[PDB]
């Protein structure tokens, strides 16, 4: 409707008498495009509330403003939504014109400065080039050429700095599909962890991102192993605010399945769709054996007992003692326990380096044993005050 012309007129008139960037033929075209309230392009502060609609092919007219453009909003605001609205366009020719043809040293290093960035406020798109090359070629090339695109990127990340952490989101979004094309998801799980911490700032705080992120966190935590098993599911319950079923309900049963460890609960967990991956069969016994071990480690540690045996370990995992010795060693190399399991003695020696977070049940007795037992040293040291 007329919301494009009316709102832009107020902000422009209070600054410029006549629109410097808008050509007098293009001024009427602002409200002439669509029938909706918000169109596919805008300027200055009005552009902040504007985003892409369907296929913003009219951005060429917005790029046509160069000379007098900076008299309204700074000249570096062109590339803000230029490549943001084309994210759903998926075109190779339109990407090369805004990346390779953009090059560097255009007008910005002559009469102005350069803040790099470019997707917020006003910044130059040189830093935007190296960030968007990996996304455009993500669905084009394969795992071979995908490594060379990360070399010019990761090295650029350490070469220059940016205040917003959103630049890692595009870095983690590329590695998300890069690790998805592979087999082992261990690297895919650690990638989504730092991606969630960067969701708090701007650049799409909407809940549409949590829908696709919950699907990544469900598969990453299933076949990945870093900290506990399900312990990271209750830290950020962003999945409870989105669709419950369609692969999102597997984490509902997985929460109470690992605490129990019954085979009947696993039938509702894995289905025919997820059972076509051979990696699932390997980590099916890795999740249950670890969560049953985490309980035994908390159980074995009371006061003086650092040592387990082959009884409670094999009965909980329902596995023969011959394999269990070598199956824990796969989790031993992860930094859990440094102990050395014996054979003839049938006793598990445990050197426990594991942090084991989520405290507060122990701290009642744990913290008091660092005072009352330490007070025994203070009482016995009062007889040393002679000199």
């Amino acid at each position: 409707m007329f919301n494009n012309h009316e709102i832009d007129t107020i902000l422009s008139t209070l600054r410029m008498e006549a629109d410097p960037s808008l050509h007098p033929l293009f001024e009427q075209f602002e409200k002439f495009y669509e029938e909706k309230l918000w169109f596919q392009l805008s300027e200055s502060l009005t552009k902040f509330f504007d985003d892409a609609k369907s296929t913003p092919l009219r951005l060429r007219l917005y790029d046509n403003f160069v000379s007098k453009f900076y008299d309204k909003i700074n000249q570096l605001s062109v590339v803000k939504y230029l490549l943001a609205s084309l994210k759903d366009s998926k075109d190779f020719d339109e990407s090369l014109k805004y990346l390779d043809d953009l090059k560097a040293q255009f007008q910005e290093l002559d009469s102005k400065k350069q803040r790099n960035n470019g997707s917020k406020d006003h910044g130059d798109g040189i830093l935007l080039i190296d960030s968007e090359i990996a996304r455009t070629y993500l669905l084009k090339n394969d795992l071979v050429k995908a490594r060379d695109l990360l070399d010019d990127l990761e090295k650029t990340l350490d070469k220059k700095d940016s205040i917003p952490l959103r630049i890692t989101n595009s870095f983690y979004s590329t590695n998300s599909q890069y690790f998805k094309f592979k087999n082992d998801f261990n690297s895919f799980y650690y990638t989504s962890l730092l991606y969630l911490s960067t969701l708090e700032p701007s650049t799409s705080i909407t809940l549409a991102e949590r829908q696709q992120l919950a699907y990544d966190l469900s598969i990453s935590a299933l076949l990945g192993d870093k900290i506990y098993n399900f312990g990271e599911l209750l830290h950020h319950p962003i999945m409870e605010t989105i669709v419950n079923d369609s692969n999102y309900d597997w984490l509902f049963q997985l929460l109470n399945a690992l605490t129990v460890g019954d085979f009947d609960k696993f039938d509702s967990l894995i289905k025919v769709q997820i059972s076509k991956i051979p990696i699932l069969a390997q980590h099916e016994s890795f999740l249950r054996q670890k969560i049953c071990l985490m309980t035994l480690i908390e159980t074995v540690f009371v006061k003086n007992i650092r040592m387990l045996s082959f009884e409670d370990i094999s009965k909980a995992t329902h596995l023969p003692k011959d394999n269990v010795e070598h199956l824990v060693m796969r989790a031993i190399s992860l930094g859990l326990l440094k102990g050395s399991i014996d054979q003839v003695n049938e006793l598990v020696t445990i050197s426990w380096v594991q942090p084991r977070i989520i405290s507060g049940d122990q701290i009642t007795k744990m913290k008091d044993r660092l005072v009352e037992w330490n007070d025994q040293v203070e009482k016995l040291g009062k007889k040393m005050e002679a000199r």
């Binding site: 795992l143 071979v144 995908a146 490594r147």
Partner: protein, 148 residues
């Protein structure tokens, strides 16, 4: 004509008579050919002593490419008779960084296939501990991942 034993003795002290310290480039082709004569003769310990004074001085000069790609090819053939897999991994070192800078991955990948294949043949090492994690061996052939 079938003459072998008398071939290595001709090029031994003759290269020193021309340029001793002067021109190494003309001396390169003589040491390489004489070391090949010891391989056909069947004596691996002969060609080892023949190359001494040249040392690493080529590495202290700008990279001439195919030069460094020759010596390390004939040094593995010397270790082939000895069947020592520890020295072969050291001769594959400088060429590993040569094809990763100057040349492309066309000839770089198939050489790496035998570089990590020989690392399992030695009880690790001080240098091999840094040879564990590599950035460029995580792609292309899956057996390169299997060896990794």
């Amino acid at each position: 004509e079938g003459k072998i034993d008398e071939a290595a003795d001709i090029l031994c002290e003759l290269q020193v008579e021309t340029y001793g310290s002067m021109e190494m480039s003309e001396k390169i082709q003589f040491i390489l050919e004489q070391m090949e004569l010891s391989i056909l003769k069947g004596d691996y310990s002969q060609a080892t002593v023949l190359s001494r004074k040249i040392l690493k001085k080529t590495f202290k000069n700008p990279k001439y490419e195919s030069l460094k790609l020759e010596y390390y090819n004939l040094l593995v053939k010397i270790s082939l008779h000895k069947r020592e897999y520890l020295e072969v991994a050291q001769y594959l070192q400088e060429i590993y960084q040569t094809d990763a800078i100057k040349s492309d991955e066309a000839k770089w990948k198939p050489v790496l296939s035998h570089i990590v294949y020989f690392l399992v043949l030695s009880p690790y090492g001080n240098l091999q501990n840094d040879l564990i994690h590599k950035i460029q061996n995580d792609n292309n052939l899956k057996k390169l991942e299997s060896q990794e």
